[PDB]
Structure 1
């Protein structure tokens, strides 16, 4: 009667998991299986019958699965005798009903472990008085039983600590029972691991008894994985209980290749705990001769093996162990007197340096953080051993700055490890660039400790590159030793000199040697653009020496300005390569940096610099617009040093007059007004495309770009003297505020205000051009002229940038990309002008006649059709600086009338697109990521607009009604969105001040209904993140004691939270309703009602990647 039903089930399985079965028989079989679990009361003895070892494992995997199902749901409708019969029968399965440990399927053990762990979840807190003793006794009987016990303990700890697939009150009961008996649990795990490991040691080698070797080995693996499952979260006292004997056992396991990875992971998890400082002291035991003996022996033994998938991972693990150990030593010294410098610090530094010189790029990048923590420490940066290893570290660092080791090539021994750790040359390029940017900071931290040797090696390297001839891939290259060694030397010298002038006294600076190097790089000459860029960066790096010997100032000029006109490669026979543009750009940039950081040196030469610049501007076709306006920015930076209002005023009028004639001409005025004439001027209406006849339009859009760039530069660079006395003397102070603050006037104001109107017209036409009605007016080859650039797409999508040789590569290679870049840089540059316009000319720009209405009629014309990738730079570049740089007197004049409808539209749009996303390769995730970053920028803008404990401007906003009815729903509706980093930002900093200033209106608003659902749904959204849990509960506690003594409608949703006892709630609510603070005082009532809200706590996905989500102290191997 049951054996026939079990045969029917076996038929359902053999037709279910069969590729030959048609879908109809298959779907009906599935229905019979799920309906067997759901509809049958005799599923327990059937499932127990199917799990017999004699049956096929598949059927068994079904049977226990069925059984599992029972203890999940059908348990509720069960009797006591059925329960105890199920426990006894399942334990009989663990003791006897299991296949041989060597050949038993692992997933069978996993399902059985699911059963036992679920039965533990159900009744272990009270109904299992001797479960630990029982698991111990049954484990002692055999090896299979010990392994299964390891599975049960690991999965149990995973579910109770991380996944929380268990009633919450039972979760606290089980967690407290674990914490109480944790000494016995960890003692059992350690004793069993040591026992099975010792038996493995005694049976390491036998003639024909390998079954016990592989068996006890696998048992040791399971025990190590369970220990790794507990070490991550248990208290530190159990790790160091028996005088840290766990650490010595794990170190003894490092020599065993079959168990080394597990021991290394357990040790790494142990030393990576950022817990209580006094409990982390005994970790320093690992600096001893014994622990470092096993660690170093197993480490350099693993390196002796080739690039095998095992030895490399183990080597990474040990490297991370040494890193986290060093971070521990850095984190302990200085805070406690009992912590001292280890006796074997020198050998540790030598081995760590050996990891720094390793071919693997990953291993080299892993040590950089610990090195920075060593150099940054106050005590260890004075230890003579570290200072003794600093020269070797700097030499190895210089060796590491050269970009070599691409996985596609085979020129370096790093290429092999790069093939192991990376997918393509692009990944290796981006990773190497970032890690190099980090070793710049760590390397400077090393240079401040030994300036003499660092400057010595930098100078020697510079002389080497100036004298030595190296292979260069046309005599030009980007991957050759020439370019990579030139770049590495340039960055090294840059960091060395920068930190030198940052730390060294002026009395101890090698002026003669630095001046010598500056002369050597000024005399050096190359026709290669990239090398020329390296030379320019070396001149800008060596420039501080000019202050001691300003005689070099002419020649330096000659080196920079000549580089501005580096068209010597090709004039008109072929287009200029991207390398050339990069060189001229480096030249103009270096000129700006010189005029910005040393204005008093260039000021007496303002006449010759102005004359040479205007001689470069005499020919319109010679210089690029960015180059022209960059040199203009330099001239303005020099002009600021005049410190006289009328002088800088006259110079700016004369400088901007050519921009005034082109910008204020009625032809240009009509171009920026009519949307059709704008297209005819830019030239996007071209039906048939030919390389010729496109030049006049290029001069048109080039002239417009020149005007916009010039306005942006003059607004950005012009400034009045910092010192108030020099401001009054030069005529820059024209009044005083109501509060008594000074009033300043900018010389560029009178000129820029004449351009503001046409600028706003251009912004109007550009914002309108995104409408599909006007977008369809463009030609077919220019339908994507307003689309997002490919570099922006690959950048926001996280994918690496394309890898190309700058020496042989056109600047655009596509007229469509030239158009797209033009529209992007123009659209962003205009909002840069309006962004910097406020702080540049504050009162004269804020008192503009009908300012807010003109901005709403120019900058916010078509916000529906404007995409996200154009909206976010607008808010970050224009709105945020405009709000943050506006006084509270002019606050309600133009800030609020713009912020109201803008924030409203942001709430509506973000709500819509976020609904589209949450309702469910590179094209869709692109838009999704755009929405996410747009949400981040909106939340940051709203945050700084209202929070610095609420700021003054925030309250001045809270006076208004529209910004409140649009501000309150946004910050609290933002919690229900997937962006986790933006949730923690608004909760602790923004969401709470939004209530302390509406206490008088909260009674009239009755917003208790929307607020509690918003915060609860927001907890349901992320949940898993500990930060969002702590902050979201902090808000949940703040909104609990604030609205409960006012409304009774809180209990309408407070009781809708699942797994809630009315006795518990009413015994933690009514006692909280009455203050009784004079009777009972409590400060930590948060941890009391956290159990009252757990259906919203959220749980991470825990069916696919079980171990990685649970263990949070294991660094990713990357």
Structure 2
């Protein structure tokens, strides 16, 4: 009987929808329900009984779900009359079986529409041709049935087009039929939206009949929400049909609170569709008079006053609409198709700028991408409208550079919006950093399109900063606006001197500003750093007025020895250290970019640095050797080999004396003398002075040599090059050959440098690392800041004014060892291009490098091996001329590539077997692998290079190279296998195809490519490229070697009968 079963079902569903129900009871009721749905013969009458309006919404939903279930699973077990009865039943449930729009729950409408959708998917076109006419004659009855039809069409389109929850046969049938009736469907949706928006607006403001309005409105929303389910994939013919009536009504609805979000969603999905540019051309109708009128009206409501969640979500949606629209215009105009600058292109800008001046950081940051795409367009950057909107954009960008809007603070009106967009101040901090790095480039483009007004704004911001406003400053509004003004000024000036001519630059204003920054004085480290960046930015103006050269020096050198009001009482702070380092950097940049202007003052500067280094304890080693770098940078202006050589030898005489002493030799060559001289010997454990001065002197020598190899150079102009005695000769190709003045001085220190590198590599041995005391036994480790730097995890800024000094002495030691390593290999990397011939023709230099540079690679860590390859090996080989490839590059690269290959193999073996102490090392393996593969790729292929061929013509380097390349496909790295198969493997094999090939290394090779297929597999890219590679290997190596066919036989689920046919056609001519 039906009624007893219906009461039972009511009890079951009532129990299941009760959260306080017991689990045993839940499983009993659920089991009874599933069994009922599976094998009951009166499911349809029961479900129709439960879905009647007299029942609770839970029960009605359950019955409608029963109907959906019998359509979904038991439709093929039903007769024709049963199917007709169910169809007419649910159709009349649409007709008169539901409540009103405003009184019915959405889960009942969804539950009812699901049934009709499921029947449509069962048999729409062949067995139900009058379905759309039935939805039409149903919709004409009222707005309830209309909303139901909207539900049905939306869920149908989603199910067949987006999710494809159908057999592909029925899926293609229904999609084709939709494509055929798309004009009628979009006609129904557009007409419904039009007429219902009319019915709503006619009663939008009326107290007599609100339920009527809320009826039509709720349908107008529904239509929109269903339109968004079709616009993304429907042909553009219907989106623009009836003179783009859909897009114009869509833009008008942006000003209706109840409909603005849906219309903005449909506009977003309509303006984001991709494909043929000719198919995206009609989207320019959104720049029409009515469309840009309504869009501009909606954007102008972004006053930024207060945060209303509804309004703000709408503003983000519309912002995305304007962004994607701008990207569309930049895409269509660039193709030079018959598309012209829109007549209302100004209005769009005026709308877009509304989101640029908004307090919300997310809106402006979202705007930045389309701003960048706009400022580099070849047609739009020359448009007077953009050039007229650019000053206001520059002002807004100035308001963007200032770090305001923390979720915790309440300084700027942006803060509240941040509280709505970010969980904490940290997420807002990272977002702000990324958006600032993005803002720099677009801001630069704006400065390119208008340098004069940009210079006015930058300078005026500088003056305002000069005249305005833990006794020092720590990330206060003063420091934040100082940093913003500093960034803006630096970019504006650096770009202005790039776009304007030497006749167009307003010298007087610039030198006025420079004077103002020089006279400005502060005892606060951070503000002084901003000042030094400002004078460093304003320095190009001194070319026109060199008389300011001394004052500039007085501002910089003073800051080199800057200290707080207390000097020896408190430890040195990171802030003041950054002021001294920043000053030294400004001196280096100064002497490097304008050495002809500083050359007259070389006497005073040399003596000043001399007095500054008279006290070995006054300046740090980075500061000393930075000033020395500046000195040699000025000495490059002598343009005379002999004079520069004499100055360099005189300047290096103390460093050469300390470095070439018997004691320094004994300490650099021996391990025990080194570990005792450095401080790792004993645990007063808190005092690092016993050997800290020693480490400072060694670091002084290394830093000095590095700076000399890095900053010394011959004149650029050829006439000035050979006129000073630098040209030794010319290559057979005509390219000149030069000699470096520092060569004879660095070469005499080269041997002790190599000895130090040898000892440093030897230190990582486990029996050599055991020497250090337990507080120092982790001194050769990776710094926690480097760990969190590579691991991606950022840490909040330790305020540089207090708790600044690295209190861990172990951290001091780790900084020392890391700096020494990277600096030594930096010298070995720079030595090539600085002293090309004389550095590459040293006797037994390759044997020496193997003896020192690569002596204990087995124990050298990854975070030390990677900077050796990037910093030393890559410049050594990429700058070496071909005349020494046999002499230098090959003998080093052979064992290097062999070891690198093997090490990556074992380490990836450790990877495949599978808290942060081990998560970091894996990332180290990945990045080191990228660096190695990039080294081989840049070193061999351009296909091959004379170095690639030359290395290939050698036996060891060829083998190690090919083994590395092919077994690299087995790593769990897809981006690398795509580049490796296409650019690396096939040029190798093609280069070694003609000749002898090993009888089974072919099996190892093909099986390695098969390993690449097994590892990646699903990634379409390495699947296609790997399949192509293996196909070339099989078609090129099977007729010569039979061993591969067995490797094909071991493949799972391969048929031998078709394999024999493939080989049969393979043998045929």
Q: Is the pair's TM-score, using the shorter chain for normalization, greater than 0.5?
A: yes
Instruction: Tell me: CA distance 1:290–1:1010, structure 2 relative to 1, closer, same or farther (3 Å).
Output: farther
Shift of 1:829: 1.9
Question: How many Å apart are 1:645 and its aligned residue?
Answer: 2.2
Structure 2 contact 944–987 (Cα < 8 Å) conserved: yes
| Aligned 8 A contact 2:113 2:148 in 1 | yes
Shift of 1:322: 1.9
- Aligned partners of 2:49 and 2:376: how far apart in 1? 66
* Residue segments in structure 2 that go unaligned for 5+ positions in a row: none
Residue correspondence of structure 1 range 598-677 to structure 2 within 5 A = 598-677=594-673
Q: SS of the counterpart of 2:737?
A: strand
Distance 1:946 1:237, change over 3 A: farther
Cross-structure match for 2:685? 691
> For 2:943 and 2:1036, how far apart are their aligned partners in 1?
17
Corresponding residue for residue 1115 of structure 1: none
Shift of 1:309: 3.4
Structure 1 unaligned residues grouped into runs of 5+: 1074-1118
* In structure 1, C-alpha distance between the alignment counterparts of 2:388 and 2:947, rounded to whole Å: 54
Supply the distance in 1 between the matched residues of 2:4 and 2:881 (Cα, whole angstroms): 86
Range 117-126 or range 854-863, more displaced: 117-126
| Closer/same/farther in 2, CA of residues 733 and 97 from structure 1, 3 Å limit | farther
Please report how far the alpha carbon of residue 597 of structure 1 lies from its aligned counterpart in structure 2 after TM superposition: 0.9
Asked if 1:370 is matched to 2:377, the reply is: no
Distance 1:395 1:208, change over 3 A: closer
Matched residues in 1 for 2:81 and 2:1010: separation?
41
SS of 1:848's equivalent?
coil
Deviation string, structure 1 residues 729-773 (Cα, Å, up to 9, x no partner) = 333233444555433322222232333333333333333433444
1:224–1:263 CA contact under 8 A, matched in 2: yes
Residues 143-190 of structure 1 show CA distances to partners (whole Å, capped at 9, x for unaligned) of: 898878877877777788777888889988887777677666666665
Moved more, 1045-1054 or 354-363: 1045-1054
The normalised TM-score by structure 2 is 0.83
Q: Give the drift of 1:1028.
A: 6.8
CA shift in 2, pair 1:769/1:174, >3 Å: farther
| Cα distance in structure 2, aligned partners of 1:631 and 1:94 | 86
Aligned with 2:66: secondary structure? helix
Matched, 1:940 2:934: yes
Worse-matched range after superposition: 761-770 or 26-35: 26-35
Greater shift after overlay, 855-864 or 577-586? 855-864
Check whether the contact 1:418–1:428 (CA below 8 A) recurs between aligned residues: yes
Kept in 1, the 8 Å contact 2:295–2:351? The answer is no
Distance change >3 Å, CA 23–CA 353, structure 1 → 2: closer
How far does the alpha carbon of each residue in 1:441-479 deviate from its partner, in whole angstroms, 9 at most, with x for none?
32332233333322233333323333333xxxx431132
Asked if the contact 1:570/1:576 (under 8 Å) is kept, the reply is: no
Q: CA, structure 1 residues 73+697, in 2 after alignment: closer, same or farther (shift >3 Å)?
A: farther
Match of 1:895, SS state, is: helix
Mapped contact 2:302–2:355 kept (Cα < 8 A)? no
CA 722–4 in structure 1, closer or farther in 2 if over 3 Å, else same: farther
Distance 2:902 2:135 in 1: 58
User: Quick one: structure 1 residues 5 and 658, their matched pair in 2 at CA, closer, same or farther if it must change by over 3 Å?
Assistant: farther
Q: Post-superposition shift, 1:501? A: 1.7
Alignment root-mean-square deviation, CA: 5.5
- Cα separation, partners in 2 of 1:1013 and 1:27, compared to 1, 3 Å: farther
SS of residue in 1 equivalent to 2:300: helix
Moved more, 98-107 or 921-930: 98-107
Higher deviation after alignment, 49-58 or 659-668 = 49-58
Give, in angstroms, the shift of residue 660 of structure 1: 2.2
Aligned residue in 2 for 1:566: 562
Cα deviation code 1:815-836 (max 9, x no counterpart): 2322222222222222222222
Match of 1:778 in 2: 772
What does residue 479 of structure 1 align with?
Answer: 475
CA contact (8 A) 1:518 1:539 kept: yes
- The DSSP-based 3-state class of the residue aligned with 1:127 is coil
- SS of residue in 2 equivalent to 1:134: helix
Q: Which residue of 2 aligns with 1:347?
A: 347
Cα distance in 2 for partners of 1:763, 1:889 equals 27
Other structure's SS at 2:229 match: helix
Structure 1 window deviating more from structure 2 (792-801 vs 823-832): it is 792-801
Bigger relative contact order, structure 1 or 2 (CA pairs below 8 A, ≥6 apart): 1
The 5 A counterparts of 1:72-91 are: none
TM superposition shift of 1:813? 3.1
Higher mean displacement: 989-998 or 23-32? 23-32
- Could you tell me how far apart the structure 2 residues matched to 1:845 and 1:642 are? 23
Contact map agreement 1:167 1:1059 (CA 8 A) in 2: no
1:303 and 1:312 in contact (8 A); partners too: no
**TM-superposed deviation, 1:591:** 1.1
Cα 1:43–1:757, aligned 2, differ >3 Å: closer, same or farther? Answer: farther
Moved more, 40-49 or 436-445: 40-49
Shift of 1:208: 11
Q: Residues 3 and 466 from structure 1, CA distance in 2 versus in 1: closer, same or farther, beyond 3 angstroms?
A: same
Q: Residue 252 and residue 522 in structure 1: after superposition, are their counterparts in 2 closer, same or farther (change >3 A)?
A: closer
Contact 2:564–2:576 (CA under 8 A) maintained in structure 1: no
What CA distance in whole angstroms lies between the structure 1 residues aligned with 2:76 and 2:769? 64
Larger Rg over CA atoms: 2
The 8 Å contact of residues 360 and 414 in structure 2, kept in 1 or not, is answered as yes
Q: Give the direction of change, closer, same or farther, for the CA distance of 1:217–1:999 in structure 2 (3 Å limit).
A: farther
Structure 1 CA distance, aligned partners of 2:24 and 2:895? Answer: 57
User: What is the deviation of 1:632?
Assistant: 1.4
656-665 or 693-702, which deviates more: 656-665
Change (3 A) 1:353 1:847: same
Of the structure 1 ranges 133-142 and 856-865, higher mean CA displacement relative to structure 2 is found in 133-142
Q: CA deviation at 1:962?
A: 4.8
Cα deviations by residue, 1:250-285 (Å, 9 ceiling, x for unpaired): 223323434433332331232234543333333222
Aligned counterparts of 1:435 and 1:550: Cα–Cα separation in 2? 38
Structure 1 position 507, deviation (Å):
1.9
Q: Is the 8 A contact 2:798 2:804 kept in 1?
A: no
Deviation at 1:581, TM superposition (A): 1.0
The more displaced of 1033-1042 and 577-586 is 1033-1042
- Give the superposition deviation at 1:580: 1.0
Indicate the residue corresponding to 1:58 in structure 2: 58
Per-residue deviation, residues 843-896 of structure 1 (Å, max 9, x unmatched): 333333333443344333444444433333233222322232222332244334
**CA-CA distance at 1:315 after TM superposition:** 0.9
Query: C-alpha separation between the residues in 1 aligned to 2:942 and 2:964?
Result: 19
- Determine if contact 1:426/1:803 at 8 Å carries over to the other structure: no
Instruction: Evaluate the alpha carbon distance shift between residue 236 and residue 873 of structure 1 in structure 2; reply closer, same or farther with a 3 A threshold.
Output: farther
